[PDB]
């Protein structure tokens, strides 16, 4: 439907030992869900009590992505051992909404209210918090200048109101940041430390469950890739019940229900048949589907396009396979993947559905790959370092075709590094990420993506010889856009 699970892999890796993840269990997934909900509530109260703002939209989810890049802890989702403690992602996102969040504007009275709301918010901040005398008089002058300019009987237009806000924000920004810096850092630190405590509780409950089940807790051939295997045996399956309401699969575990479309459920059964080797009678299938859906609900609120990751059209994947031999997605999930082989964030549960684990821990010696990472610049930067490390270590055909938003104000360090890479064979611009129909029946597309999508070809010499981005192959890839 929106996938081609018949295409076989051409990724080649060293044979690796089974991973030591604790086997997922709906009882533990439910506890992680209820603690992640409490963690979001701590984040909402900290932003409200310390800065008088709501949490910046999608910032908690983006925090989870950034923390995943550096976390050395034991939970597959929540952080517990991170250097730095202070997330640069969450810090930058909170600071962008201080003193207030800038909302979408369409009319003149909206722009006038937004300009006035910013000015009095900066004044209320100056009047109630510690600030150096230099920063106090600069903000005070700009706020007084704006208030008196609004007091003119001569009324300006909407673009005049907007430009006045852009300049006022330009002048007060540095002083507002120096005022709130210590407080925002404290929010990032406290939410990380609370998460670490939650991780310790989940870990202990999971070890206790396995002990209650009497469950105890390599050669380097080159082989075609294969899903991540677990070394710890699966605990006895639990009672998960399935029924369909119209074309929606409904799975209940002890009265707790998760939902997924019928089309995706049938896709998961196929991936499971192609990827799972420890459940010949599908006795554990429904339990693992429940954990999979719940895990991604905890990660991304629920189960087309958001402010975290874009979707590529199906014909683009077809053209990538036919024109450049692509068989593998570096950033996908069992729910959204196009190929049956992919890298994903949660190998403890995704491995049963074809995951090869996170890409930053994947070491292919050969293969043709596609990558459209989530909209997390910290992950993207680690991605580029991994790309160049892999391309420089192997002389076998290796190719990566990367899709990232064409944003230049300012460009991410990852995009700048890729444009200067010694492996860059070709670069172009394709249409922007847009909503791709899947549901059957939503958040808006990330703002950085609206100008278009940069497509970068990173190949070693063997890969450039085998999958060269010739003019004819580029036109066919461009022809895939409807």
Swiss-Prot record:
Disulfide bonds: none annotated. S-adenosyl-L-methionine binds at residues 372-375, 433-435. The lineage of its organism: Eukaryota, Metazoa, Chordata, Craniata, Vertebrata. The keyword Ribonucleoprotein does not apply. The chain holds residues 178 to 673 of 721 of the full protein. Its EC number is 2.1.1.62. Changing residue 375 to A: Strongly reduced methyltransferase activity. This is mRNA (2'-O-methyladenosine-N(6)-)-methyltransferase. It catalyses: a 5'-end (N(7)-methyl 5'-triphosphoguanosine)-(2'-O-methyladenosine) in mRNA + S-adenosyl-L-methionine = a 5'-end (N(7)-methyl 5'-triphosphoguanosine)-(N(6),2'-O-dimethyladenosine) in mRNA + S-adenosyl-L-homocysteine + H(+). It comes from the Eukaryota. The keyword Transferase applies. GO terms for biological process: methylation; mRNA processing; positive regulation of translation. The gene is pcif1.
């Amino acid at each position: 439907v929106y996938w081609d699970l018949d295409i076989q892999t051409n990724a080649v890796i060293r044979e690796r030992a089974p991973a030591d993840h604790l086997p997922p269990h709906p009882e533990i997934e439910l506890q992680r869900a209820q603690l992640t909900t409490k963690l979001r509530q701590h984040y909402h109260e900290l932003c409200s009590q310390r800065e008088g703002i709501e949490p910046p939209r999608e910032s908690f989810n983006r925090w989870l992505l950034e923390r995943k890049v550096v976390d050395k802890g034991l939970d597959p989702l929540l952080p517990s051992e991170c250097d730095p403690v202070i997330s640069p992602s969450m810090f930058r996102e909170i600071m962008n909404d201080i003193p207030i969040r800038l909302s979408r504007i369409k009319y003149k009275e909206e722009a006038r209210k937004l300009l006035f709301k910013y000015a009095e918010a900066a004044k209320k901040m100056i009047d109630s918090r510690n600030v150096t005398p230099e920063s106090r008089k600069v903000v005070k002058w700009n706020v007084e200048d704006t208030m008196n300019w609004l007091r003119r009987d001569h009324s300006a237009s909407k673009e005049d109101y907007m430009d006045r806000l852009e300049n006022l924000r330009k002048q007060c920004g540095p002083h507002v940041a120096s005022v709130a810096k210590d407080s925002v850092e404290g929010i990032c630190s406290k939410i990380y430390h609370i998460s670490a405590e939650y991780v310790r509780r989940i870990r202990q409950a999971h070890l206790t469950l396995l002990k209650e089940c009497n469950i105890s807790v390599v050669q380097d051939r080159l082989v075609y890739c294969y899903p991540v295997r677990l070394s710890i045996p699966a605990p006895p399956q639990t009672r998960v019940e399935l029924h369909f309401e119209n074309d929606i699969a409904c799975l209940r575990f002890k009265g707790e229900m998760v939902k997924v479309s019928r089309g995706h459920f049938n896709k998961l059964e196929l991936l499971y048949r192609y990827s799972c080797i420890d459940d010949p009678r599908f006795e554990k299938f429904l339990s693992r589907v429940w954990c999979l859906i719940k895990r991604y609900q905890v990660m991304f609120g629920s189960g087309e396009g958001s402010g975290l990751q874009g979707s590529l059209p199906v014909p683009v994947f077809e053209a990538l396979n036919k024109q450049f031999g692509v068989t593998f997605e570096c950033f996908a999930s069992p729910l959204n993947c196009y190929f049956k082989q992919f890298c994903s964030a949660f190998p403890d549960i995704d491995g049963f559905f074809g995951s090869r684990g996170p890409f930053l821990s994947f070491s292919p010696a050969s293969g043709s790959f596609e990558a459209n990472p989530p909209f997390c610049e910290e992950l993207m930067d680690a991605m580029v370092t991994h790309f160049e490390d892999l391309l420089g270590r192997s002389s076998e055909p290796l190719s990566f075709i990367i899709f990232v938003p064409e944003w230049r104000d300012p460009p991410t360090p990852a995009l700048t590094r890729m444009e200067a890479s010694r492996f860059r064979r070709h670069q172009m611009t394709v249409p922007a990420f847009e909503h791709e129909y899947r549901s059957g029946s939503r958040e808006e597309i990330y703002y950085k993506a609206i100008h278009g999508t940069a497509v970068i070809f990173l190949q070693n010499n063997a890969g450039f010889a085998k999958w060269e981005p010739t003019t004819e192959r580029i036109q066919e890839l461009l022809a895939a856009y409807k």
